[PDB]
Amino acid sequence: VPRGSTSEVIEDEKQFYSKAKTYWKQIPPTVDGMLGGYGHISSIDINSSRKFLQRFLREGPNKTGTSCALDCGAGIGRITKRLLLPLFREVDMVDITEDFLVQAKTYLGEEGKRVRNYFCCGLQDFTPEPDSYDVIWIQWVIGHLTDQHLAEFLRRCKGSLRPNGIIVIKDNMAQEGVILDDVDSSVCRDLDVVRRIICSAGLSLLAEERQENLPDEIYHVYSFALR
Amino acid sequence: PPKRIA
Numbered sequence: 531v532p533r534g535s536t537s538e539v540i541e542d543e544k545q546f547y548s549k550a551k552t553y554w555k556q557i558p559p560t561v562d563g564m565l566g567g568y569g570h571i572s573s574i575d576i577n578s579s580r581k582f583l584q585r586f587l588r589e590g591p592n593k594t595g596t597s598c599a600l601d602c603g604a605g606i607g608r609i610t611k612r613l614l615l616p617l618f619r620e621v622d623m624v625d626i627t628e629d630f631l632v633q634a635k636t637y638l639g640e641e642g643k644r645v646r647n648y649f650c651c652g653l654q655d656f657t658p659e660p661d662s663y664d665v666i667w668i669q670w671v672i673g674h675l676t677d678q679h680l681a682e683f684l685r686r687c688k689g690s691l692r693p694n695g696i697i698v699i700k701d702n703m704a705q706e707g708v709i710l711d712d713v714d715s716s717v718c719r720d721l722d723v724v725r726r727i728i729c730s731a732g733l734s735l736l737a738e739e740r741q742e743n744l745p746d747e748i749y750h751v752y753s754f755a756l757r
Numbered sequence: 758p759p760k761r762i763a
């Protein structure tokens with residue numbers, strides 16, 4: 531049987547979180563560190579993310595606003611710099627790794643002056659301000675949370691959306707089940723698991739898209755827009 | 758990050 535939940539694969543939740551924190555503390559604060567040796571795919575990623583997001587920014591009743599975005603698991607701000615700052619008047623960042631948020635101030639340069647809050651916190655401990663964000667962007671980090679913490683975090687995110695706001699998840703997906711990476715202390719979940727968690731959080735799918743033009747050897751990557 | 762299928 532494939533595993534369907536993190537409670538089948540995580541031996542010790544405190545250790546699951548503490549190992550991950552130790553792992554990121556020893557990664558270079560660079561794009562290649564953010565992307566696990568795949569820094570070269572960054573522009574492919576950012577281009578696809580932009581096209582994806584722009585579907586929600588068209589004029590009409592449901593137009594997503596452009597006042598403020600939240601970058602979750604932001605690291606040094608790769609996504610903040612190239613995707614979000616150009617489109618949103620202000621951006622807030624949240625990440626567990628202080629060294630990355632420090633580096634972000636250099637990495638983001640002058641445009642980084644529009645980053646408002648730098649929150650140094652685990653997602654599992656973070657409660658975003660109600661009615662604050664037009665877009666909450668969650669990329670390449672959901673594997674670091676347990677199913678219970680991810681569902682809860684998504685509920686808190688829902689309460690922080692402005693009218694017409696969306697949450698975006700973009701992440702690695704397993705073909706089947708829930709797969710533990712015991713080196714970076716994360717899990718990779720299949721699309722059925724991720725959709726289940728989204729539904730548990732009282733969220734609905736607006737769109738789902740597979741990322742194209744990636745190296746053949748890596749986990750498939752999907753984007754979900756939610757409200 | 759993006760990563761090799763184990």
Ligand SMILES: Nc1ncnc2c1ncn2[C@@H]1O[C@H](CSCC[C@H](N)C(=O)O)[C@@H](O)[C@H]1O
Binds near residue numbers: 554564606624625670
């Ligand atoms: N529990 C947690 N809460 C918040 N951030 C976490 C976390 N576990 C890991 N992270 C952060 O998740 C990031 C993964 S690297 C991906 C960085 C960014 N999303 C991008 O795509 O460029 C690192 O910056 C790491 O510090």
